[PDB]
Every structure is written in structure tokens, then in C-alpha cells.
Design a protein around this ligand. Structure first.
Ligand SMILES: CCCCCCCCCCCCO[C@@H]1O[C@H](CO)[C@@H](O[C@H]2O[C@H](CO)[C@@H](O)[C@H](O)[C@H]2O)[C@H](O)[C@H]1O
Ligand SMILES: CCCCCCCCCCCCO[C@@H]1O[C@H](CO)[C@@H](O[C@H]2O[C@H](CO)[C@@H](O)[C@H](O)[C@H]2O)[C@H](O)[C@H]1O
Ligand SMILES: CCCCCCCCCCCCO[C@@H]1O[C@H](CO)[C@@H](O[C@H]2O[C@H](CO)[C@@H](O)[C@H](O)[C@H]2O)[C@H](O)[C@H]1O
Ligand SMILES: CCCCCCCCCCCCO[C@@H]1O[C@H](CO)[C@@H](O[C@H]2O[C@H](CO)[C@@H](O)[C@H](O)[C@H]2O)[C@H](O)[C@H]1O
Ligand SMILES: CCCCCCCCCCCCO[C@@H]1O[C@H](CO)[C@@H](O[C@H]2O[C@H](CO)[C@@H](O)[C@H](O)[C@H]2O)[C@H](O)[C@H]1O
Ligand SMILES: *C/C=C(C)/C=C/C=C(C)/C=C/C1=C(C)CCCC1(C)C
Ligand SMILES: *C/C=C(C)/C=C/C=C(C)/C=C/C1=C(C)CCCC1(C)C
Ligand SMILES: *C/C=C(C)/C=C/C=C(C)/C=C/C1=C(C)CCCC1(C)C
Ligand SMILES: *C/C=C(C)/C=C/C=C(C)/C=C/C1=C(C)CCCC1(C)C
Ligand SMILES: *C/C=C(C)/C=C/C=C(C)/C=C/C1=C(C)CCCC1(C)C
Ligand SMILES: CCCCCCCCCCCCCCCCCCCC
Ligand SMILES: CCCCCCCCCCCCCCCCCCCC
Ligand SMILES: CCCCCCCCCCCCCCCCCCCC
Ligand SMILES: CCCCCCCCCCCCCCCCCCCC
Ligand SMILES: CCCCCCCCCCCCCCCCCCCC
Ligand SMILES: CCCCCCCCCCCCCCCCCCCC
Ligand SMILES: CCCCCCCCCCCCCCCCCCCC
Ligand SMILES: CCCCCCCCCCCCCCCCCCCC
Ligand SMILES: CCCCCCCCCCCCCCCCCCCC
Ligand SMILES: CCCCCCCCCCCCCCCCCCCC
Ligand SMILES: CCCCCCCCCCCCCCCCCCCC
Lengths: 282, 282, 282, 282, 282
């Protein structure tokens, strides 16, 4: 059976207005996040800088995606009477997310493993399996949602969607295994935070499959609005929220190492206005 | 009853000229503010860096909003005689402010609490209640002013406006309570400044509801000009003005801590060409 | 009586070619000054960083104004024969300067007072009176030149121009008074430079009123070219020239303080390949 | 004989959707790479900074190329039915790669020699022969593929392609000779990595000639898609992958020198979460 | 006699393709150069930082010029049949170079004098005479080539070209005199390099007059291609090549001063993988 695609829906001006709000709010919040990332990048040790690098990629790629999308929104719908009607650049208000997620979902996995206690080359097996699994999960979604059937085929959404769901299970079982190994070998205070950051990431990722069910089941401008709102909201929460949580863990670990002799940090580490470690000279 | 919207008004060339001035002046002043923020970002301790991060978000989001708005101004009105007549991209000379305020008003609240003396459960509870309350106040305005009724419904402005006014009261009672707790536990010199910064922020926020009354009551190009002038002016005063006042407080607090042993700062802190603290090595 | 406006003149191709060269040479030279400002910003102390901040805004706002004016030149005139004929975006090749000057003229005043010896009530009173007076002088020009008769009214140029000339006198009497107070309390070497920088600024500001007399008196593409050449040239001289002169004074003062114990600088200060002060550690 | 060019093919919507994905994915991944480069640029000694500089050029040039290409994609094909028919700006979705490769392939050669053990004069002969040979190999490809015959001449692809293949052999024999000389004079641990980085670079370069065989042999939108996919994929692997491998070698060498007295590094060097060297003060 | 101008020639697709290559290659190489400049800016003493500042201006102005030119190329010629036919914005593919050279040729002169041994105020006489002479040489070219006659007048090319050639002689006699004075007072090793850098700059400048002879003598798309190729190539060689040679001299001089007590540098200086100087603390 055939279903209209999400970018083949005429939008009212309450729908058009919300969609521009959330697209522009999401791009804004991720440019804040990018700035924050840069300003706070020296609170973390060089042992834990992979976390900073990940997060900077996540924020750059996502900010660009959202600019593209906001500019395609302006040039993707033509107002006819009281309703905005999609043209051929309307697909460019939706498709560009898959490019963002293609980089970000792998980088979120890398950021999480950044602050775990895996080292050397068994680390590398886990980082690669994660980056693969993550990338394959998005790309197989892209194919169902955008490429094969042109977004308009229920069977192609269900097949490529199911396949994507398998790489979700594989990626999540790799990460959750990595973290379960680490928690014993961290300090109690960090292990606590790393458990929570793992629950926050996996939980965030469960929201995104729901946008894909809408596309299968419901078509309309209401629902095209629902999709954008859901996905925009989830990007803000899961990319501001989670990337601030890993940074606390990096800082706390950095400080723990300072206190222990493992290394020396130029500034002091203050987490929650509690000094974790003092500044030091080589 | 129905009222024409603000972006649905034909502008004379004196009105068009003023509107471009102020939009372009505001974006300019906030790019200065962004630069200033970066250049002075190392005058503050790591204990107080949340203040720098907030202010940088406030300036980035706002600068972008104002670029969008200035570019939409050029492509949103067509000169047809002695009048500039609005296109369908003239909503985009007004609506993008709500996106800015959605990030900024929460970040201004965070910046203010940055330099207060709050820690524990109560700190995080207070930061979240503030960020929520602030965000909800803007968004409920957006809905009245832009989305529901299309800006052209008096009942939708009065209902969504009243609702927004409740989240104003809730947000302001949270912040004013937080600050009232802190002033005892600061030093006299900082407590003085934190009282003043609180009065300057709350007072600034009372200006923005007046732009919203115009939209309810008066329609015309005079009044569309009045709205932009009011809102542009208020952004300059309350974003340049207030974010420079919190930076003095962060600096003064940073220095107070240096002097006290709590921490060490690489450079000396000068506050009104008065040296507050000397430079130090770990 | 009526006069055509400067942006209502048909330019030849010699006139059109010289106006793009000067408009693009001014944005190019003010992007070199933005780079010079950032590369040479740690040669000055933290007692005199209010000068690095003022100059960075004077060069960021000015480069953004000249990019817009060069982009609106490409889309503001149409070649209809051997003549470039103005559109409705031709006002945007002239008007954007008033936005630049609105930020810059106040910031130039701040930069000059940066390196003077004012502190107390008198300092803040002086900085505010200057920033006000400067801003009011430009804005009252904008109204005469762009807004009130559409640039086409001789009485509106002479009235708003006279008013602007009063805020010039007020602003210049404030600054010259501030500097006259400082010169006694500086060192001979700096006092000398601060006198010269004051003469260079006031003298630079006297050029800009001449562009405004042309607009009153003469209309033509020759004269529209004369205006742009005059104003572009003056921006280069007074914004490259003067902002390099204050930086020497900041450096010399920084070094004088180093030598005196007042503070310590990480690098040495070399002014004219002559070493003023050595590097030092806290 | 004549062959249609790759930019003269009508793409289906699945072929346009893939092509936009990969172009946008590649530009995204190279902006991550650029960020990474900047954030990690102080892990390396000043003796080995040429490696950082190379890699930064590689990432900047390539990111820009890919932006151009993504913007030309939007404005290079027009949807006329179920097909995206090529405009005259569809050559600009392919040609800009040759500009990227013209800078990058020489810079990749420089980056590889960066971490080898060459003197500083006989170094120069090798660096120049490499940069020449590399540049000549791309440019002679450009001429066959784009300029002479207009991409549509089989004899011009085979002649200019063969010529390009000779500068490949010359460039690769210079580099492989340089590295074979160095491996003895490195430490075992670095020599190992430098062998692998050499195999990874030469192997990466063998993929790009296959895109050029497609252009000779096969024409279609399938094949225009195959070309972009191949070339995009190879850019990600060989520019993210290889430029991270040289950075490990620079770091390991930097640390080896620290440990040996040759120099001192401000931070510690952690590679695979193993401290290679401690931080130190002059 | 009247000669067609260089932007009044219909380009083939081979000539259009080359022109886009070289414009895009030159802008690319100068963005690399800009990056390089920033990454290596701390290898030089503060005594010699004028060299860094010059070079950064040279790279910024030139990169922007080349972006403008590449964007004007896309929108300056229309494909009509088998030929690209110039529109009225084809002059913007050639004219913008004069703006670049107007800043750069003066800054190249400043960079060269940066590392010579002139100090105080007799330095200033030489720096001003140079910057004047250089600026006047370009501007008088612009007038012959672009403004007077519209590029189409042989007598205006020969008169304004001859005049430009006089300011070349004056500028070169000032610089060569300055350098001849310095070589005695440098160290043998630096004097050697400063002689070579002087020969490389003067020699580079002799290439640019040849583009101007073509414009006088030959008109055609072959020749419009020859002009762009010549000028693009010369920009790459003389702006990458020369600005890397002055940086070696600054570094070598910086190190010589370190070794001598004149100053202290934070990093070590390595030139050709030979440690020139060690890192030091105040
Ligand atoms: C929808 C729009 C919503 C937009 C608002 C988003 C609010 C989140 C931003 C708050 O981000 C805030 O970052 C600072 C870092 O500077 C963190 O603060 C932490 O690090 C700083 C850094 O030196 C330390 O001074 C401090 O002791 C510690 O608490 C906070 O834990 C976090 O809450
Ligand atoms: C219409 C719009 C016109 C806008 C004009 C500009 C508005 C005023 C901006 C002035 O911003 C100025 O920033 C500098 C930043 O160094 C502050 O200066 C502060 O920090 C510096 C740097 O450590 C210290 O030397 C100094 O003692 C302290 O006052 C000033 O307190 C503030 O007045
Ligand atoms: C018409 C358009 C023409 C454009 C030409 C513009 C170039 C002229 C300006 C050159 O600007 C030049 O900047 C450097 C900045 O390091 C200044 O140099 C100054 O700072 C450096 C850096 O610590 C010191 O070593 C030096 O002692 C001191 O002179 C020069 O005094 C100034 O001459
Ligand atoms: C067509 C376009 C092709 C473009 C190719 C450009 C080739 C040259 C680019 C790299 O140019 C190269 O830069 C590095 C910069 O660190 C210089 O390297 C120098 O500084 C580094 C950093 O302190 C030292 O480790 C090193 O000892 C020293 O040689 C080289 O001397 C120079 O040759
Ligand atoms: C298709 C698109 C998929 C995109 C995925 C791209 C991400 C994969 C690459 C991750 O890149 C990652 O960078 C960090 C940079 O700190 C490197 O990390 C390295 O430097 C840090 C910083 O000093 C050290 O703590 C660490 O010991 C060392 O491994 C990792 O070795 C590398 O794995
Ligand atoms: C910052 C962006 C993030 C974390 C994006 C996450 C996206 C997913 C986890 C998507 C998962 C999907 C499935 C498992 C099934 C249906 C298709 C997808 C791609 C939406
Ligand atoms: C920098 C921007 C700031 C501080 C913006 C502030 C905006 C408000 C405080 C808006 C308040 C409103 C009401 C309380 C009622 C009417 C609707 C609003 C959104 C204008
Ligand atoms: C960098 C820009 C500067 C210093 C601009 C200065 C502008 C003025 C000093 C303008 C003065 C004017 C008058 C006093 C009378 C006529 C109108 C003005 C605005 C041109
Ligand atoms: C990051 C980009 C890289 C490494 C690009 C590499 C490109 C080549 C090595 C191309 C080689 C070619 C031949 C040797 C023959 C056919 C033509 C070329 C240009 C594709
Ligand atoms: C990086 C750019 C540089 C060094 C440009 C240099 C340009 C010249 C030296 C031009 C010289 C000319 C003459 C002396 C005569 C003919 C006209 C000119 C402008 C081409
Ligand atoms: C969908 C929620 C998945 C939760 C994953 C995290 C739980 C385990 C944490 C490590 C032990
Ligand atoms: C309308 C869709 C909005 C989706 C927002 C994103 C959901 C993120 C859920 C995070 C859950 C966090 C749980 C943490 C548990 C720690 C113990
Ligand atoms: C008619 C009423 C339409 C209102 C739609 C608003 C949807 C709100 C979704 C949740 C917003 C949360 C945003 C967090 C950043
Ligand atoms: C023409 C309307 C412009 C409105 C500008 C309002 C700016 C904000 C008001 C701030 C009030 C500060 C009070 C400080 C008290 C201590
Ligand atoms: C006809 C006269 C129009 C004058 C408009 C004046 C608007 C108020 C000026 C606010 C100045 C403060 C800006 C920072
Ligand atoms: C027609 C364009 C005018 C350009 C020059 C404008 C700047 C003049 C500055 C005068 C400085 C005098 C210094 C006295 C000491
Ligand atoms: C930095 C610029 C210095 C001044 C440049 C020259 C000013 C006068 C321009 C005159 C050009 C017209 C010549 C026509 C004959
Ligand atoms: C078909 C798409 C393009 C292929 C992907 C890129 C392949 C890169 C080259 C392979 C790397 C070999 C590494 C060997 C290391 C020993
Ligand atoms: C049906 C379309 C399939 C396209 C396959 C493209 C090649 C696999 C993906 C490579 C990703 C590299 C990162
Ligand atoms: C097609 C024209 C290309 C010109 C390239 C730039 C010429 C630069 C000449 C440099 C000469 C070097 C002399 C070194 C002296 C030892
Ligand atoms: C038929 C194509 C002619 C191209 C001429 C190439 C000129 C030299 C290129 C050097 C680039 C650096």
C-alpha cells in the first residue's frame, strides 16, 4: 500500500509557524551547545579529550543540518491561499536529519566510551563495532524513509525499519556491555554517573523510532508537524542534555586523576561549585 | 474581534528606514557583545564560568536571530509606490525574536544564578524551575502572537498573553527568592551588585509585555515601527547592559576567592582600574 | 527645496567601478584590522583591555556594514545602457554606514578614555555622556540624511544636520576635557601620545560632515562617487590609523606598570623594535 | 568514440537522494575532522607541527569543496517528472573535487613526510618532488575528465588518464623510498605505525582511479551515483582515517623526544589511554 | 584604438572550466595559507609579530577576493549554445583582484621590512614610503585597466600602465635600499635568507605586469584564460611561497635572540628539524 510522504503535506500557517519555530529553536540550541563545548574544553584532562572532540562534532554537524533545514523550509513551501504548499525542496526539510544522525549517533557512542575504562585495542574492537552498528542503523532508516519507495511505500518502511531496529539492538548491546564492564573499575561516584548517562542515552534513542512510526501510519500536515516537533525536541534534549553529562564525568575523572598523581591540571575543577581538584604546575 | 497583524501593515519609507536601522543596529551591538564576551572570558574563575557560557549563548542566538530578521526585511516587503507592501516573508521579521527569547530568557536566568550562592538539591531545582518557567513564558507568547489566530485574534492574544504572564510571575518569584537567600551569604560589595543586577533584569523584562499590548490594541505601520523600536532597544539595553553587570560580579567574586585562598587566577583582576587581585602560579 | 538623494543617481561605469573598489577596499582593510586586533591582543594588560574590546567591535561592526553595502551594490543598480540605474536597494549602499557609525563613534570614544587616567564618579559619568553624545550625533544625522525627507529635503538636512552638530560639540568637549585632565597624571611619553591620538580622532571626525554638505549642495553620479570615496577613505584612515595609536598607548602603559611593580605581563613589550618591558612569572 | 559525461545524466529520485546524502555526509565528516584537528593541535610537539598544518589544510579545502558541491547539487538538477534533469551547473557537482584533490593530495604527501626522519635539505628535494608529482597527477586527470573533450571523449580520458597514472607511479616511488629510509632510524614502535600509515595511504589512492574507469566505460544515473558514492566514501576513509594515524605518530614521536630530553611538552601525552610522557616546565 | 576588454570575451567550455579550476584552486590555497598562518603564529617572538600580522592580512584579503571572484564567475557568464557568454557581472571576475593587491602589495612590503634591522622612526619613513608607493602602483593600474576607457582603451592602458610602472620603480628602490642597509647588521645566516626573500619578492612582482600587456595586445577567450591562469598561478607562488620564507626569518631571528638573552620564548624553535632554541620560563 502507498502512504503520502511527510514532505508531500500542505501546511496551514499554524503548522508552518510551529515548524519554523522548532527548526530554528533546535539550530539555536545546538549553536549554544557548540559554544559551550569550546568554552569548557579545558576543564578536562588530555586523557579524556576524546569526549570533547566527539561532542564538538555532534554539535557542529547538527547545527549545520539545522541551518540547511531552516533555509530549505523558507524555500520549500509556496503559500497558496491560506495554506503553505510543498515544492521539491520540501524533502530537504526532513532528509538532512539523516545526515546529521549518521555522524552523531556514532559520535555519541564514542563519547560514551570515552569516559569508560576500556583501554588499548579491545577498546578499538568496541569503538568500531559501535560506530559501524550506529552508522548502519541510521543509513538503513534513510533507505526506508527517503530513498526506496520515495518515502511513500509502507512495505519499504517496514522492511528497512525492521532492519534498522536490528542494528539498534546490536549497537545497544555492545555499549551496554562495555559500560557494565567499566562500572566495577570506576570510582563509586563516577560509576553512578556513567550508569545514569547510559540510561539517558538509550532512553533518548527510543524516541526517534516513534517519528518513523508516524510516517508509516499517519499522513497529514498535523502529523508532518508532529514529526518535526518530536524530532526537534528530542535532538535538543538528547544532545544538550547527554553531552553535558559526559562532560561532568570527564571532569570528575580528570580531577580524580589529579588528586591521585596520575596527572596535573592547569585549572582547578569545580563541579556543582564544589572544588574537586586544585591547579598545579608540571 | 479581529485585528490586523504587525507584519501585515504597509510601511512608508520613513518607517521602512527606521525599521532597518534598528534591526541592523541591534544585530551589530550583539556581535560586539559576542566579541566582548570572548575577549574577557579569562577574567573569571572556573568556579564562575557558567556565567561566561550563558552570556555567550545569549549573544550568539540573538545575533543570528537578528541577521535572519534583517535578511527577511530585505525580502519581506516590496516597494509599490510610496509604500513598502508586506510579502509572505514579512512574518519572518517578527517571529524569529520568539526563538531568540526562547533560548535567552532561560539563559539570562541561569547567568543570574551563576553568581549567587546556591548549592545542593536546591540549586538544581532552582535552575530547572527557572529554565522551565522562562521557556514556558515565551512559548505561550509565541502561540498568542504568531500561531493561534495568526496574530490576528484579540481573544487569542489575551488568553495566551495572560497565560504567559503567569509563567512570568512564577519565574520571577523563583529567581527573586534565590537571590534573597544569597545576599546574606555574599560579601557586602557583591551582594550590593547582585541586588542591582536583579532589579535591572526584572525591570528589563517588564518592557517586553508592552510590545504585546500594542499588537492587541493598535495596528498600523506607525505601530509596527513602534514595536520593532521598543523590542530592539530593549534587547540592546538588557543584553549588553545586564550581561556586563554579571561579569563584574563574577570577576569580583573570582578575585575575592583568590584573595582568600579558595583558588588562584593567572591574571590580575582589575575592576574599575582598581586591582582586586594579583596574578598567581599554582 | 528638494534635492535628489545620493542613491537616486545613475552611475556611469567609471563611477560604478570606483564605488565597488572603495567599498570593497574598506571592508578588506577592516578585516585586516580585525585580524591585527586579535593577533596583538595579549600585548596589552588587563587594566587596559577595554581598548582591545572597543577596537574589536569598531572593526567587526564596520566590516559587516561594508559586506552588506558591497552586496547591495551588486543588487542595487542595473546596467541599462552605458549607465547603471539605481533600484530600491540602492539606499542600502549608503544607509548601512549610519548603523556602523552608531556603534563605532561611541566605541571610539570609549577606546580613547580607556588609556586615560580617569576613575571614580567622573569616569562613569564621562563614559556615559560620551556614548550618549556620540550616539545622538549619528542618529540625528541618519534622520536628516535618510529618514525625514527621504534624503531629498534640504530643510530636513539643515535642521537635523545642525542638531547633529550640537551633539558633536558636546561630545568633543567632554572627551577633550577628560584628556586634558589626564595628561598631567600620565608619564611624559604617554601623555605625548595621548595628545596626538586626541588630535587625530577629532580631526578625523571633521571629515565626515563634508560628505553631508555634498548631499545638501550637489547631486549627480560624480557626487555620489565623491561621497563614497570620501567616506570610505575616512573610515580606513580613522579606524586603522587611530586604533593602532591607542594600542601603542595601552602597550606603553602596560609596560610602564610592569616596570613599576603594578603588574606582570607574560610576554615582553616591544614598541618600535624597542623592548619596553621583560616577560615575568607571577 | 564518445561517452556521455557523468553530469549529463538524468537522476531518478533515489539517485538524487543518495547523491545528496553522500555529498552532505562527506562535507559533514570533514567538518568534524577540521574541528578535531584544532582541538587536538597541542598534543604534538613544535618539531612535528607540520603534520598539524597539513591536516588542517586537507580538512579545510575539502570541507569547502563539499559545500560548494552540495549547493551546486541543489541548483544543478531540475525535477521534470520522476527524473532530476541536469542543468548547466551540474558539472559543478563533480568538477570541484579536482580542486580539492589538487591541494590535498600534495598535502597528504607532506603530512606523511612530516613524521619521517629526513634531514632538512635532502628533505626539500623529496618534499618538492612529491608536491609536484602529486599536483601533476591530479591536474592531468582534470584535463582528461573535465576539460579536453568536455568529459565526453574516450580517447582524451585514456590519454590524460594514462599520463596521470605515470605521475602516480613517480609520486609513490618517491614517498615509498623516503619512508623506507626512515623506518631504520625511527624507534620500533613508530616505525611500525609509519609502515602502516604508508600502506593505508597508497591503498586509499588506488580507489580513486576506479571512479575514472567508470566514466570511461559506463554512463547512466546508476553510474553517476556509483561515482559519487565511491569518491565520497573514499574521501571519508582516507582523510579521517589517515590523518588520525599520522597524528598518533606525531604524538608518539613527540613523547619519545620528551622522554629523551630532546624537548619538553606542556601537557602529558596519552595514546590509547597510556601516558606516554608527563607534562613539564622549561 | 579600441581593444575588447578581458571580460567581454565568450569562453568555450574548456576555457570556462580552466578558469573555474584556477580561481577555485587559488582561493583554496590561500585559505590553507591562512590556516597555516594561525597555527604557526606562536613560533615567532613578539619582537617580530608584525610579520605574522602582515601575512594574516595578505591571506584574508586574498581569500575573500577569490571567493567573490568564484561566485561572480558562476553568475557572470551564461551558456548559450556551445559558448559561455559574459553578462554584465563578468567584470567582477577580474576587477576584484585590484582590491586584493591594493591591501596585499603594501602588506607584502611591510612584511619584508618586518624582519629587517630598521628601528624607531627612520623605519617609519621607509614603511610609509613603501605603503604609499605600493598602493599608488596598484591603484594607477586599476584606473588603466578597469576605470578609464572601461578596459577598452589602448592609450589609457599605456598611460596609466606607465605611471604604475614608475611607482613600481620607486617602491622597489625603497625596499631594496632598506634591505641593503640591514644585511650587514643581521647575522650571516639570516642575511642570507633576507637576500633570497628579497629576490623572490621582486621577481614575483615582475610577473604581474605581463597580464597587463596581454590586455593591451591580445583579445580573445584564449587570452582571457591566459590572464586568469597567469595571475592565479602568480598569487599562489608569491603569497604561499614568500610568506613562508619571511616566517623562517622571523623564527630564526626569534631564536637568535633567545640564545642571546634578548628575550625568551615559550616553545622551542625547530627550523628544518634542527632545534634553534630551547623553551624557557621568565
Ligand atoms: C530549550 C532552551 C533551553 C536552553 C537552556 C539550557 C540550559 C542548560 C545550560 C546549563 O549549563 C551549565 O553549564 C555549566 C558549565 O559552565 C555547568 O556547571 C559546571 O561547570 C562549571 C564550569 O567551570 C563549574 O563552574 C560549575 O561548578 C559546574 O556546576 C552546569 O552544570 C550546567 O548546568
Ligand atoms: C548604541 C550602542 C552603543 C554601545 C557602546 C558601548 C557600550 C559600553 C561598552 C563598554 O564596555 C566596557 O567593557 C570593558 C571590558 O574590558 C569593561 O572594563 C572592565 O574590564 C577591564 C578588563 O579586565 C578592566 O581593565 C576594567 O577595570 C573593567 O572596567 C568596562 O567596565 C565596560 O564599560
Ligand atoms: C589603502 C589601504 C592600505 C593598507 C595598508 C595597511 C598597513 C599599515 C599598517 C601596518 O600596521 C603595523 O602593525 C604592527 C602590528 O604588529 C605594528 O607593530 C607594532 O607591534 C609589534 C608587535 O608586538 C611590535 O613588534 C612593534 O614594535 C610595533 O611597531 C606597526 O607599528 C604597524 O605599522
Ligand atoms: C598547489 C598547492 C600545493 C600546496 C603545497 C604547499 C607546500 C608547503 C606547505 C607546508 O610548508 C611547510 O610548513 C611547515 C610549517 O610547520 C614548515 O616547518 C617548519 O615549522 C615546523 C613547526 O615549528 C617545524 O617543526 C619545522 O622544523 C620547520 O621546518 C616547513 O618548513 C614548510 O616547508
Ligand atoms: C561514516 C561517518 C562516521 C563518523 C565517525 C568518526 C569518528 C571516529 C573517529 C574517532 O576519533 C577519535 O579521536 C580521538 C581524539 O581525541 C582519538 O583519541 C586519542 O587522543 C586523545 C586525546 O589526547 C587521547 O586521550 C587518546 O588516548 C587517543 O586515543 C581516538 O584515537 C579516535 O578514535
Ligand atoms: C542526536 C541524534 C540521535 C541520538 C538520533 C538517533 C536516532 C535513532 C536512534 C534512530 C533509530 C531508528 C530506528 C532504530 C528504527 C526506525 C528508524 C530510525 C533511524 C529512526
Ligand atoms: C533578551 C530578551 C529578553 C529578556 C526577553 C524577554 C521577554 C519577556 C520577559 C516576555 C514576556 C511576555 C509576557 C510576560 C506577556 C506577554 C508576552 C511576552 C512573551 C512578551
Ligand atoms: C569610524 C567612523 C566615524 C569616526 C564616524 C564619524 C562620523 C561623524 C563624526 C559624523 C558627524 C556628523 C555631523 C557632526 C554633522 C552632519 C552629520 C554627521 C553625522 C555626518
Ligand atoms: C583526499 C583525496 C585524495 C587522496 C585523492 C586522490 C586521488 C588520486 C590518487 C587520483 C588518481 C588518478 C589517477 C592516478 C588516474 C586517473 C585519474 C585520477 C586523478 C583519479
Ligand atoms: C599578491 C599580489 C601581488 C604581489 C601583486 C602584485 C602586483 C603588481 C606588482 C603589479 C604591477 C603593475 C605594474 C607595475 C604595471 C602594470 C600594472 C600592474 C598593476 C599589473
Ligand atoms: C532502553 C533503556 C536501556 C537502558 C540501558 C542502561 C542500563 C544498564 C546500565 C549499565 C549496567
Ligand atoms: C515529544 C518528544 C520529546 C522527547 C524528549 C527526549 C526524551 C529523553 C528521555 C530521557 C530519559 C532519562 C532517564 C534517566 C534516568 C536516570 C536514573
Ligand atoms: C493549537 C496548539 C498547538 C501547540 C503545539 C505545541 C507543541 C509543544 C510540544 C512540546 C514543546 C517542548 C519544547 C522543549 C524544547
Ligand atoms: C523606547 C522603549 C525602549 C525600552 C528600553 C528599556 C530598557 C530596559 C530598562 C531597564 C531598567 C533598569 C532599571 C535599573 C534599576 C536599578
Ligand atoms: C520621526 C522621528 C522618529 C524617531 C524615532 C525614535 C525612536 C526612539 C530612539 C531610541 C534610541 C535608543 C536606541 C539604543
Ligand atoms: C577625503 C578623504 C579624507 C581622508 C582623511 C581623513 C582622516 C584625516 C585625519 C587627520 C589627522 C591629523 C593628525 C594630526 C596630528
Ligand atoms: C586609502 C585610499 C586613499 C585615497 C585614494 C584616492 C582618492 C581619490 C580617488 C580618485 C579616483 C578618480 C580618478 C578619475 C580620473
Ligand atoms: C567503494 C567505495 C570506496 C572504498 C572505501 C575506501 C577505501 C580506502 C582504502 C582501503 C584502505 C586499506 C588499508 C590497509 C591498511 C594496512
Ligand atoms: C541502495 C543504495 C546503496 C548505497 C550503498 C553505498 C555504499 C555503502 C555505504 C558506505 C558508507 C561510508 C561511510
Ligand atoms: C604563469 C606565470 C606563473 C608565475 C609564477 C610566480 C613567479 C615567481 C618567481 C620567483 C623567482 C624566484 C627567484 C629566487 C632567487 C634565488
Ligand atoms: C591546456 C591547459 C593549460 C594549463 C596551463 C597550466 C599552467 C601552470 C599551472 C601551475 C599551477 C600551480
Amino acid at each position: 500500500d502507498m502512504i503520502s510522504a511527510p514532505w508531500e503535506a500542505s501546511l496551514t500557517q499554524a503548522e508552518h509557524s510551529l515548524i519554523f519555530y522548532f527548526l530554528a529553536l533546535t539550530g539555536s540550541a545546538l549553536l549554544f551547545g557548540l559554544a559551550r563545548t569550546w568554552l569548557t574544553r579545558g576543564e578536562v584532562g588530555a586523557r579524556y579529550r576524546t569526549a570533547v572532540v566527539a561532542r564538538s562534532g555532534i554539535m557542529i554537524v547538527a547545527t549545520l543540518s539545522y541551518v540547511f533545514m531552516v533555509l530549505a523550509f523558507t524555500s520549500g513551501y509556496d503559500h497558496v491561499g491560506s495554506l503553505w504548499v510543498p515544492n521539491s525542496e520540501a524533502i530537504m526539510t526532513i532528509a538532512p536529519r539523516y545526515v546529521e544522525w549518521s555522524i552523531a549517533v556514532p559520535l555519541l557512542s564514542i563519547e560514551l566510551l570515552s569516559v569508560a575504562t576500556l583501554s588499548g585495542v579491545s577498546a578499538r574492537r568496541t569503538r568500531l563495532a559501535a560506530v559501524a552498528g550506529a552508522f548502519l542503523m541510521i543509513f538503513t532508516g534513510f533507505l526506508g524513509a527517503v530513498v526506496i519507495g520515495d518515502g511513500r511505500s509502507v512495505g519499504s518502511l517496514i522492511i528497512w525499519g525492521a532492519i534498522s531496529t536490528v542494528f539498534w539492538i546490536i549497537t545497544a548491546v555492545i555499549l551496554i556491555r562495555a559500560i557494565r564492564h567499566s562500572l566495577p573499575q570506576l570510582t563509586p561516584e563516577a560509576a553512578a554517573l556513567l550508569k545514569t548517562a547510559t540510561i539517558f542515552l538509550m532512553s533518548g534513542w527510543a524516541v526517534y523510532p516513534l517519528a518513523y512510526l508516524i510516517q508509516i501510519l499517519f499522513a497529514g500536515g498535523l502529523w508532518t508537524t508532529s514529526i518535526h516537533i518530536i524530532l526537534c525536541t528530542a535532538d535538543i534534549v538528547v544532545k544538550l542534555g547527554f553531552c553535558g553529562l559526559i562532560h561532568r564525568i570527564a571532569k570528575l575523572r580528570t580531577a580524580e586523576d589529579v588528586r591521585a598523581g596520575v596527572d596535573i591540571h592547569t585549572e582547578a575543577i569545580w563541579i556543582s561549585s564544589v572544588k574537586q581538584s586544585d591547579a598545579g604546575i608540571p
